[PDB]
Design a protein around this ligand. Sequence first.
Ligand code: HEA
Ligand code: HEA
Ligand code: CU
Ligand code: MG
Lengths: 38, 90, 50, 52, 104, 76, 51, 504, 85, 266
Amino acid sequence: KAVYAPSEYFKYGEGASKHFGFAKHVAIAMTVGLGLSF
Amino acid sequence: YRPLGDKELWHEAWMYEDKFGTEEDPIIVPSLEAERIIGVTDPEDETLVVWGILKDGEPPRQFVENGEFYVLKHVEYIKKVGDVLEAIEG
Amino acid sequence: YDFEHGPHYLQPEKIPNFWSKFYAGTGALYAVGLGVPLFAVWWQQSKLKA
Amino acid sequence: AFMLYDFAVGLEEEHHVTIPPYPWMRIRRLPGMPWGQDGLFEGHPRVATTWP
Amino acid sequence: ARAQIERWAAEHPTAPRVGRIFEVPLGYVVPRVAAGIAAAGCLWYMNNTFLQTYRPESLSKEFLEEQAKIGEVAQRMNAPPVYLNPFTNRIPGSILGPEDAKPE
Amino acid sequence: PFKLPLDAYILMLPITYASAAFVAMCCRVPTADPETSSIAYYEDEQKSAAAAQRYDNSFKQFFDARIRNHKVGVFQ
Amino acid sequence: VQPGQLRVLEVDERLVLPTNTLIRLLVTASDVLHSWAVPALGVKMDAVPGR
Amino acid sequence: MRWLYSTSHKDIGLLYLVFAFFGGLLGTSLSMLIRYELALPGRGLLDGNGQLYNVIITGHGIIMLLFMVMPALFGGFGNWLLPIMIGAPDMAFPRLNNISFWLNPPALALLLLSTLVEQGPGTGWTAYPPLSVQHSGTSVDLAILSLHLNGLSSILGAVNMLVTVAGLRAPGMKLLHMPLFVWAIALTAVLVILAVPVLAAALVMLLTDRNINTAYFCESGDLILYQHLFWFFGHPEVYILILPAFGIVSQVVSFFSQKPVFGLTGMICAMGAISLLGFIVWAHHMFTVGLDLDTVAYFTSATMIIAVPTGMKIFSWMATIYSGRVWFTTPMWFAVGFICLFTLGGVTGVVLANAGVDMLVHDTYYVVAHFHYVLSMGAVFGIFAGVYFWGNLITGLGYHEGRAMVHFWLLFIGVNLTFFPQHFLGLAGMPRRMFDYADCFAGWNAVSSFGASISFISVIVFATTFQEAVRTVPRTATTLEWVLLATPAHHALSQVPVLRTASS
Amino acid sequence: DSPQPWQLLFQDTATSTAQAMIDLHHDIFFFLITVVTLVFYMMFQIITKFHYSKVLKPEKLTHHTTMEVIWTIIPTLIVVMIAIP
Amino acid sequence: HQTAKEFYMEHIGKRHPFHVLPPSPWPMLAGWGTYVSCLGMAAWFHNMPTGGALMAFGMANIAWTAITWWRDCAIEGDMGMHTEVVRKNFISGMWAFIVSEALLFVGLLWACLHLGMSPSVALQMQWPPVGIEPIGWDKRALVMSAVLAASYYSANVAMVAKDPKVVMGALATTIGLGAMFLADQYLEYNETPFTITDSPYGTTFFVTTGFHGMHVLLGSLYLTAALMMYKRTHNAGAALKSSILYWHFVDIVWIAVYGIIYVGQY
Ligand code: HEA
Ligand code: HEA
Ligand SMILES: [Cu+2]
Ligand SMILES: [Mg+2]
């Protein structure tokens, strides 16, 4: 029985970025910025 | 031992060992003191470094996930590989 | 404490009356660093007012 | 060999070419020099005084 | 990456980990920054009140009312007067000055 | 040392453009009008005016057709 | 100053320039560096002794 | 005897940190006289003295530039953290490291002595001739000799740093495994070695013009030559003061996100591109001196390129925070604040790069608001981010988290209300380096002088944050200074650590 | 002509050159507004959505070549769009 | 003391090949010597009495502090504290110092190129100004170039030789050739028909050639100090190599100085 290193990361996609919606938030930010700029 | 070409003669190999440390066969780290800091890279990523501390008289310890196991051993001399054992060339 | 060969080069919990000298030094540092420009203002304006 | 020849043909020749006091000659923004009146290493001043 | 986090959290025990973005409660932060802002305002007021050696005559209320009678109008020594900054005050292009207007 | 990633060459295109423009601007100065150590350069009026107009027109002539059309803004 | 004038900004002798006319302004200085800036006309050029 | 004869890097770095704190106190004191003269129209506490106001702004600018941010980031965190981070037992030249520090108190003493001699050196921190040459007396010579001594200090420190990174790394550790603070300090050293001797030559010419009656910058000389040489020095100088802040922000953001830095090679390449472009854009400070339109054209086009590497660094920091497990602490708020507020300091630099727009806002408070965004909120936030991060390792003292948050919010409010109104003053045409202004500029001047007092209060509150520490035992980390005890030994790394590459 | 109290932007103009300068400034500000909005909104959303009370353990994301190339190539086009006027 | 060497071997020397120094008093004394000499220099600029003596006093103190510092370095070399990697780091530090001195000279020659290329109306747009008789390339300056090239090659001999007599003779020849470059620059400074106060040409000429002559003197003294360490133990190590590197740097600087000032008349 030895000292094991723990699992420290998820793989990108099955943790807490599957529910983020990156492209949706970038589209919202660009929409708000373009509306203010216009 | 890994190929000692393009290795400095004073780098104290054990770091250049040809072994993957397992639970049932760890890599024995020599040390002049009861504790020593060593650095292990991620097996899946050369850019990531995890530094750990090994202690004398302890079980095998793994620093990164899916990495080598290590056991420290207190010695009075560390073989300065490059003129210690390749001058022997046994 | 042994700063050269002990485990720590700076052992602030082992100077006697550490928190008094620390606040005295901090106060003196703030006093000098906030009062040197005012002395320079006073020195130049006291030479014109002659 | 040429430098040893040069060391014997040193301070013997002379120039008497006086120079008029042009605005770019002998600038004296502050009066004099920190070591005296003339420049350093200058034993034979050229710019003219009493400019006719 | 987690072990250095847990080590830093042990050497800094006054930093809380309670599950909110502003870990220190605002009931601690807001009164103290309010007191600091109040002390800064007192220093600013002391500078305004007690540390002036010349107050300009162009800021007296007589000067200000006589200026507000005139408006944003500049005189000329070679021409009639002109309205200053005609685009922001919306003077039309036909009108150049007060005297040249001669209102109907 | 390491392998430069794909960004750094997109970086190196305007960097190489800027370095080349800097070298060109340094080079074309001792081949211009006021860099003459004589008053006798200007007594030849034809060559002096021709050289000075050549120094005028280069890198400006790429902009004359949009100077004349008031292309001085991103929008109009 | 007097009411209708601007403090700090007012001079005794102005500079009179006609409109709709191409004007050449040669800016220089005599002792130290200066700069002739009029933000309404978009002109700001430094006055250098010798230039 | 310990603090006068030191050869250890950890003691010399701590001496730099304390000296930088003293310089920050002196500059903050000099900065309250500026904002208290400028609170109201007319004549304030300086009794209508303009020479004294010029002396005050000159001393304030030189002190806050050279004797605060430079010894804190380069000499302070660099000397303490570089050999531990790479695994070196010491510096390469330990007695040269001590004369690197010990040439700074003579320079600061000469600069402070110049204020008390004759009428002082009222020239600005750029010291343009013939204003520097016209000054009768001795004060300008003392100020320039202070500049020489500080420059020689920085050159010697960069020499030690460059030989240390090149030749004393841990076995198995190449120039790929060093953290980004080491890369930032190394590129800063390269910039220092290349740029400072140009300033030394320019100031030697200034001394000969002042005192030897030479003709470098005079009637028969060329006054644009000084501005050329000075800004060829001075624009790399402002990237010397900002790259260690990038390294610190990378280390801090990586730590509390529980994630490594996004795009490591892109980060190094962006820092290198910033370092290289800083030497060919310098005449963006000289748009109004009367240069030919092709020179102005090139320097306008080249200055806008620096935006792309900086934007990559900012987006890489945001991607580092992205998809992590983030715990917001006091150093974390000083790095999120860095990212959000250095952007406001760079976007106005883009505006200043365009020379047509720069014809209106040259030597106005738009410039001042820009360079107090990138320095009082980029470099100061970087300095204060590392004080609450590495402070228990460096000094041995903990800090109270509540009072540190009070100090952060006070500083954040006091700087967003001091320099944000200085944009509107500069767009409306208020000139720089003036103490009496027009009657219509009063409202934003009053708001800015209100913000400066909040800044001063946050300076006072910072002294109350220190407390006793709790000491624990390390097992594992991602950087080499977080496996050491707090404080480490006088000879930290008793055994030189090695980096073992696995079979992968 | 003359500055006004509580003024934000530039003064009024009497030449076409200065009006061209002001129009160039406002054209640059058009891009700056969108840049600052994108940075600030994305920072707020990244801050709120990745707090440790939401995240059990992080994800391994060191590189993304497409997004790196995208935020390298979009600002360079903005630089060259600004530079020619 | 007898266990100090034992403690060093137990804790530093047998663990890494780098050198750890004991505490030293010379950096602080050198810094405050710079303070005293700067005060003396500022007083000597404006003809304050007893100001030049104060400047000389501060410079003498800096020189003594540096001499004792370098004697300590030589002692530490002779007791075998420096391994091979330490000497490689010494050459690396000399390369960085050479780069800094190179950019100093680049900034100095930038002024020559700027002022010579476009004369101003204050000079009545004539370069060189009327009255100024410039120094020719077809004379004693060519002899200087020949002597300094001979010094380059003789210093290159001592870098590669293995016979100690050859190394000592080559170093002495290099030092004696460097001394003839300075004793003849003194003759140029005495025979020249202009001053540092006469026009930007005289200004740039004297400042740039004086900085080069100061660097020649420093390199000659460094080569002299590297020879006496070899005259004793027939070993110099990094002292020989770094002095040769600095001398070659001075030689390369003279190429730009000659080809910009003497040939280009700038
Ligand atoms: C390092 C850069 C720096 C910093 C931080 C500041 C900080 C401040 N500055 Fe400025 N300033 C300049 C650089 C800086 N400044 C320069 C270069 C000039 C031009 C001079 C010239 O023209 O010659 C100038 C001039 C200048 C002007 C223009 C005056 C004029 O045009 O005549 C004004 C006006 O508002 C001003 C005000 C302030 C205020 C209120 C702060 C506030 O932020 C007050 C400071 C508060 C702080 C919190 C910073 C102190 C930091 C510490 C104490 C941290 C140290 C800690 C450790 C080392 C652990 N300063
Ligand atoms: C901390 C030091 C520092 C830093 C980092 C900078 C960074 C920049 N500076 Fe500045 N500057 C100063 C310190 C600094 N500066 C000082 C002290 C002065 C006055 C000197 C004096 O006279 O006293 C000055 C003055 C100054 C001038 C001269 C104006 C004048 O005096 O008349 C100019 C002109 O080009 C300039 C521009 C820039 C630009 C383009 C950057 C760029 O590096 C900024 C880049 C960052 C960004 C652009 C934001 C991040 C980018 C993105 C988020 C992507 C989106 C961007 C685009 C789409 C374009 N600044
Ligand atoms: Cu700049
Ligand atoms: Mg200016």
